[PDB]
RNA sequence: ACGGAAACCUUGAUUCUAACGCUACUUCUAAAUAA
């Protein structure tokens, strides 16, 4: 709908020599930048106590957030890979657990 | 010790336009000037961290190498290791990650008359004996155009007694990039940048950057 | 009833330009450098419609169609004694301005983009200097 | 590291810089001594509302005008209209702009534009001010204004652009000297400051100024522009350490070789370090004149307008001005026909 | 006549690209980085035909034949004193607008499609540069 | 009252590190001859 016509673009670069400064050209492909990608993740709750389940609820929302402030893989220390969670919500899909405080800190802390 | 992140966020204000380049493929039908990187979707004008992490190491290895630098992995331990290394283990991965810079201030561009939000510099060549001129084009993005620079900076436990060096590289680096032009042909007058609202916020972890903003505002 | 459609504007182009003057050589008239700033001005309005609506890209519009009927009088080459005004013909053969008439959202203002670099193409296929 | 020069310009001369358009007669409006350069959108915005389009479009399309269907003017007053405020910009009358009058036929049927940034603003490119740096530096140092510069080898002379080293070299160290001088462009200095001079040609064989139709849009004397001139090497920060006292030695070849021939009460006098900025100032300043005599008035030879010795001396009209410098009152010209050497400017360099 | 069946543009690839024209020493003049945006434009055309109807990618193609047109005029190479248009030279051997004319149904698009991918590859498989 | 019954080819692992689309270039030259 926006006109987009491949998904898929090339990015031109170069390398320069810093004695000579001859430009070695290089062709590199790159995912469009607004493109989005159905991101699910599922977790099991097994023997493990409620201070557990919250623990690793923590670290799952660290490691959100730590992708957020880093880049996917790439060349991403020029400026690519970087992603953000949009609309990123729990839902218990198995047995029956609250995830309402859960939900309520994802939306809080992203 | 701990892990923190620093995220040094500023807005490169072009004083004059800039011209980073990239081949024709978002070329209009009929355009013969040389174009200007874009955005695949919104096709407006882009600063790639690829340049401006080049520039800047290029830039910062005139000052703290005091060596030949034949190169870019020979560079010296200060610069190695913010920007990374890939023949030594230590400094595979550098502590500084560079993003794309993208328009910010296109409905003041807009707000201020702007047709187009990329200009076309007609320029020519004069020979010297027959004074026979060859003129061309040169598409750039226009004068007063602010971009969303951020710059990432982690501080892992290795970054003890070495925070400082590395804070005082980055804001040299950015100096250096303010005395000279980002990408293109700026030995005519293109790609000066000017750095606004330069900033350092911890987006992680725990650490104490007060001492850091006012330096940062002291002198860039 | 509408001269532009999906299915036809590309062969229009063939017939707009194929009948434009020509100079006794056979080389054409019309050069890039004289409708340059109209596809400029196409490319840029097409580039916007794509993120802003049509409520707000009536005044550009309106721009490219004066802009038109000014380049069409403007231009003019002389060859052998004889004046000539390529980028007039160039609108009155490829229907610009009838084309611009009936621009009314966003839809046929792409169609219109197309068609114009239809037109720049073929011109170039058939020996269009620049 | 970098060493960073203040280039202070002051135009002693109208200095045009053009950007390849051309104003028409149908875009401007002269009236009440000022030409109005209304924006054509949004005049089409505001006829657009009175219902004037068709006509307008009318008089656009028109291929032949024959005598007063081509002024805008003209469509303006039989449609009686009188409300001229349509964005634009308007510049005051010279009184000089022009030979005949700016009303009737002729007059004026096209203005050379002032280059522009996205704004509408006007400046000066740093490549303009790079170029005349260029050609003072080249014209003034004998390793490259010799027999060197010219390329025999082929069907007709031309520059050796390689006598100047540049571009990347395969396994060498980088030698580009120009890359050190890194002149930057001015910034808007707002559209007050510009008039509509016209081409005079002064033949020494003739000896009177011939006018051409050759309108332009050149920047007002006596206006002050500020260029940032940074230096990464040593030697091309000695060449624009000496950039005065090289103009001085170019202008004194310039005017032993041409300026010398023409009558004393034309060429004017410097204040400040010389230079020669922008269109219309002549061949010589923009080439080693030394090398180029003979090869580009045989450029010329078989043309109808003939280049007969070593040309003709550009002068345009444009107001007198006189300086109060702390030596007394200096005027610009020193003839009362208002005669000024377009493209003249003078430069004051510093080292901030 | 179809101009591309099914057991012959394999063969016609071949022909069109050990015919096309050459310089002195014996180069190819066409190079990948002049075709490239042509290429990109038929490979999205492709993977865009293998779950979308024919019936809404009319634009495509056309945006793809105009894009053939003026790759064919806009690049050109001077040698010897006279110009070549390489792309212009590909396009009028292979017979590219040819069947790009005759893009009626989705097979015909992916034969025009896998066409142009054995045309490139053979011109690689021949010394053609990048 | 089946050479049958029970058995996950499963566990972890970033196609990642380094790289300026860079270099030189005044939108500029020519005004004859006639009156």
């Given at each position: 709908?926006?006109?987009?016509?491949?998904y898929?673009?090339?990015?031109?670069?170069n390398?320069?020599?810093?004695?000579?400064?001859?430009?070695?050209?290089?062709?590199?492909?790159?995912?469009i930048?607004?493109?989005?990608?159905?991101?699910?993740?599922?977790?099991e709750?097994?023997?493990?106590?409620?201070?557990?389940?919250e623990?690793?609820?923590?670290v799952?929302?660290?490691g959100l957030?730590?992708?957020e402030?880093?880049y996917?893989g790439?060349?991403?220390?020029?400026?690519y890979?970087?992603?953000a969670?949009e609309?990123?919500?729990?839902?218990?899909?198995?047995?029956?657990?609250?995830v309402?405080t859960?939900?309520?800190?994802?939306?809080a802390?992203? | 010790?701990?892990?923190?992140?620093?995220?040094?966020?500023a807005?490169?204000?072009?004083?004059?336009?800039?011209?980073?380049?990239?081949?024709?493929?978002?070329?209009?039908?009929?355009?013969i000037?040389?174009?200007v990187?874009?955005?695949?979707?919104?096709?407006?004008?882009?600063?790639?961290?690829?340049?401006?992490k080049?520039?800047?190491?290029?830039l910062?290895?005139?000052?703290?190498?005091?060596?030949?630098?034949?190169?870019?992995?020979?560079?010296?331990?200060?610069?190695?290791?913010l920007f990374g290394?890939?023949?030594?283990?230590?400094?595979?991965?550098?502590?500084?990650?560079?993003?794309?810079?993208?328009?910010?201030?296109?409905?003041?561009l807009?707000?201020l008359?702007?047709?187009?939000?990329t200009?076309?510099?007609?320029?020519?060549?004069?020979?010297?004996?027959?004074?026979?001129?060859?003129?061309?084009?040169?598409?750039?993005?226009?004068?007063?155009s602010?971009?969303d620079?951020?710059?990432?900076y982690?501080?892992?436990?290795?970054?003890?007694?070495?925070?400082?060096?590395?804070f005082?590289?980055?804001?040299?680096?950015?100096?250096?990039?303010?005395?000279?032009?980002?990408?293109?042909?700026?030995?005519?007058?293109?790609?000066?940048?000017?750095?606004?609202?330069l900033?350092?916020?911890?987006?992680?972890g725990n650490?104490?950057?007060?001492?850091?903003?006012?330096?940062?505002?002291?002198?860039? | 009833?509408?001269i532009?459609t999906?299915?036809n504007?590309?062969?229009?182009?063939?017939?707009?330009?194929?009948?434009?003057?020509?100079?006794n050589?056979?080389n054409?008239?019309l050069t890039?450098?004289?409708?340059?700033?109209?596809?400029?001005?196409?490319?840029?309005?097409?580039?916007?419609?794509?993120?802003?609506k049509?409520?707000?890209?009536?005044?550009?519009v309106?721009?490219?169609?004066?802009?038109?009927?000014?380049?069409?009088?403007?231009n003019?080459?002389?060859?052998?004694?004889?004046?000539?005004?390529?980028?007039?013909?160039?609108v009155?053969?490829?229907?610009?301005?009838?084309?611009?008439?009936?621009?009314?959202?966003?839809?046929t203002?792409?169609?219109?983009?197309?068609?114009?670099?239809?037109?720049?193409?073929?011109?170039?296929?058939?020996?269009?200097?620049? | 590291?970098?060493?960073?020069?203040?280039?202070?310009?002051?135009?002693?001369?109208?200095?045009?810089?053009?950007?390849?358009?051309?104003?028409?007669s149908?875009?401007?409006?002269?009236?009440?001594?000022?030409?109005?350069?209304?924006?054509?959108?949004k005049?089409?915005?505001?006829?657009?509302?009175?219902?004037?389009?068709?006509?307008?479009?009318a008089?656009?399309?028109?291929?032949?005008?024959?005598?007063?269907?081509?002024?805008?003017?003209?469509?303006?007053?039989?449609?009686?209209?009188?409300?001229?405020?349509?964005?634009?910009?308007?510049?005051?009358?010279?009184?000089?702009?022009?030979?005949?009058?700016?009303?009737?036929?002729?007059?004026?049927?096209?203005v050379?534009?002032?280059?522009?940034?996205?704004?509408?603003?006007?400046?000066?490119?740093?490549?303009?001010?790079?170029?005349?740096?260029?050609?003072?530096?080249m014209?003034?140092?004998?390793?490259?204004?010799?027999?060197?510069?010219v390329?025999?080898?082929?069907?007709?002379?031309?520059?050796?652009?390689?006598?100047?080293?540049?571009?990347?070299?395969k396994?060498?160290?980088?030698?580009?000297?120009?890359?050190?001088?890194?002149?930057?462009?001015?910034?808007?200095?707002?559209?007050?400051?510009?008039?509509?001079?016209?081409?005079?040609?002064?033949?020494?064989?003739?000896?009177?100024?011939?006018?051409?139709?050759?309108?332009?849009?050149?920047?007002?004397?006596?206006?002050?522009?500020?260029?940032?001139?940074?230096?990464?090497?040593?030697?091309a920060?000695?060449?624009?350490?000496?950039?005065?006292?090289?103009?001085?030695?170019?202008?004194?070849?310039?005017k032993?070789?041409?300026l010398?021939?023409?009558?004393?009460?034309?060429?004017?006098?410097?204040?400040?370090?010389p230079?020669?900025?922008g269109?219309?100032?002549?061949?010589?300043?923009?080439?080693?004149?030394?090398?180029?005599?003979?090869?580009?008035?045989?450029?010329?030879?078989r043309?109808?307008?003939?280049?007969?010795?070593?040309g003709?001396?550009?002068?345009?009209?444009?107001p007198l001005?006189?300086?109060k410098?702390?030596?007394?009152?200096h005027?610009?010209?020193?003839?009362?026909?208002?005669?000024?050497?377009?493209?003249?400017?003078?430069?004051?360099?510093?080292?901030?």
């Open positions: 709908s926006l006109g987009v016509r491949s898929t673009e090339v990015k031109f670069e390398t320069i020599d810093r004695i000579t400064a001859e430009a070695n050209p290089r062709q590199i492909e790159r995912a930048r607004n493109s989005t990608f159905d991101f699910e993740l599922i977790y709750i097994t023997d493990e106590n409620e201070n557990q389940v623990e690793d609820f923590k799952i929302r660290d957030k730590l992708l402030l880093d996917l790439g060349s991403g220390s020029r400026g890979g970087k992603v969670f609309n990123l919500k729990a839902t218990t899909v198995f047995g029956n657990y609250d309402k859960l939900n309520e800190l994802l939306t802390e992203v | 010790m701990t892990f923190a992140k620093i995220k040094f966020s807005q490169i204000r072009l004083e004059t336009g800039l011209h980073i380049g990239g081949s024709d493929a978002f070329a209009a039908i009929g355009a000037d040389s174009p990187i874009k955005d695949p979707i919104t096709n407006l004008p882009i600063i790639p961290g690829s340049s401006l080049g520039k800047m190491r290029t910062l290895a005139k000052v703290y190498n005091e060596k030949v630098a034949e190169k870019p992995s020979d560079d010296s331990d200060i610069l190695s290791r290394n890939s023949k030594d283990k230590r400094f595979k991965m550098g502590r500084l990650i560079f993003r794309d810079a993208f328009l910010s201030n296109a409905d003041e807009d707000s008359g702007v047709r187009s939000y200009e076309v510099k007609f320029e020519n060549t004069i020979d010297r004996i027959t004074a026979e001129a060859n003129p061309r084009q040169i598409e750039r993005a226009i004068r007063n602010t971009f620079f951020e710059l990432i982690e501080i892992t436990d290795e970054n003890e007694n070495q925070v400082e060096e590395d005082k590289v980055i804001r040299d680096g950015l100096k250096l990039l303010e005395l000279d032009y980002l990408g293109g042909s700026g030995s005519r007058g293109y790609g000066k940048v000017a750095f606004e609202n900033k350092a916020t911890t987006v992680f650490y104490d950057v007060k001492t850091l903003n006012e330096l940062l505002t002291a002198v860039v | 009833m509408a532009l999906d299915e504007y590309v062969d229009k182009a063939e017939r707009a330009i194929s009948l434009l003057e020509k100079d050589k056979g054409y008239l890039t450098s004289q409708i340059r700033k109209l596809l400029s001005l196409c490319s840029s309005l097409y580039d916007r419609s794509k993120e802003r049509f409520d707000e890209l009536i005044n550009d309106s721009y490219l169609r004066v802009q038109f009927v000014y380049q069409s009088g403007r003019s080459v002389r060859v052998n004694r004889q004046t000539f005004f390529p980028v007039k013909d160039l009155e053969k490829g229907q610009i301005l009838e084309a611009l008439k009936e621009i009314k959202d966003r839809e203002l792409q169609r219109f983009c197309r068609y114009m670099e239809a037109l720049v193409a073929y011109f170039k296929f058939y020996g269009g200097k620049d | 590291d970098y060493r960073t020069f203040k280039l202070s310009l002051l135009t002693l001369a109208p200095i045009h810089i053009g950007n390849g358009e051309k104003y028409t149908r875009e401007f409006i002269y009236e009440n001594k000022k030409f109005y350069f209304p924006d054509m959108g005049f089409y915005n505001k006829m657009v509302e009175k219902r004037l389009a068709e006509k307008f479009e008089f656009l399309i028109q291929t032949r005008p024959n005598a007063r269907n081509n002024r805008l003017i003209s469509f303006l007053n039989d449609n009686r209209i009188a409300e001229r405020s349509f964005g634009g910009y308007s510049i005051s009358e010279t009184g000089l702009e022009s030979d005949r009058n700016p009303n009737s036929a002729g007059a004026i049927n096209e050379n534009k002032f280059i522009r940034d996205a704004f509408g603003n006007p400046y000066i490119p740093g490549s303009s001010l790079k170029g005349a740096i260029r050609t003072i530096l014209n003034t140092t004998p390793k490259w204004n010799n027999e060197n510069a390329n025999d080898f082929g069907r007709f002379p031309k520059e050796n652009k390689n006598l100047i080293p540049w571009g990347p070299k396994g060498k160290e980088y030698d580009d000297l120009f890359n050190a001088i890194r002149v930057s462009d001015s910034k808007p200095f707002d559209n007050k400051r510009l008039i509509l001079v016209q081409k005079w040609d002064y033949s020494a064989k003739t000896n009177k100024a011939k006018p051409l139709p050759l309108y332009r849009e050149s920047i007002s004397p006596l206006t002050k522009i500020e260029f940032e001139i940074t230096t990464t090497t040593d030697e920060g000695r060449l624009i350490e000496e950039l005065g006292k090289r103009a001085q030695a170019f202008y004194k070849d310039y032993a070789f041409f010398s021939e023409f009558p004393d009460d034309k060429i004017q006098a410097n204040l400040q370090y230079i020669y900025l269109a219309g100032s002549g061949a010589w300043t923009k080439t080693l004149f030394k090398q180029a005599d003979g090869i580009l008035q045989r450029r010329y030879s043309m109808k307008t003939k280049m007969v010795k070593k003709v001396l550009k002068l345009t009209k444009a001005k006189i300086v410098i702390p030596s007394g009152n005027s610009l010209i020193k003839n009362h026909e208002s005669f000024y050497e377009m493209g003249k400017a003078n430069f004051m360099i510093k080292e901030i």
